């Protein structure tokens, strides 16, 4: 079978995997991508050319 084996949402400090097989032929029919955690807050915060140093006065 074409099984995927990923990691379950566990804790980060306290003392495991789950299997998935896609049965249907269309990708619209899969389960949600509940575990895609990439980020980019810079589109909305600091959306400026001339990057600001956060130590420099930011003007003059």
């Amino acid at each position: 079978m074409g099984a995927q084996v990923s990691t379950q949402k566990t804790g980060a400090h306290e003392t495991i995997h789950y299997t998935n097989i896609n049965y249907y032929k269309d990708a619209a029919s899969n389960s949600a991508n509940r575990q895609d955690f990439t980020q980019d807050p810079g589109k909305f915060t600091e959306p400026v050319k001339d990057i600001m140093i956060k130590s420099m006065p930011a003007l003059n």
């Binding site: 899969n30 949600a32 895609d36 955690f37 807050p41 909305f44």
Partner: peptide
């Protein structure tokens, strides 16, 4: 979160467009 059957099999979905300002986490907001 389970797999379902598609009511529209083999539907060709519109191509993706690089729109500015994609949100991936509400904390970015």
């Amino acid at each position: 979160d389970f797999q379902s059957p598609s009511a529209m099999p083999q539907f060709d979905v519109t191509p993706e467009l690089d729109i500015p300002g994609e949100v991936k986490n509400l904390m970015e907001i």
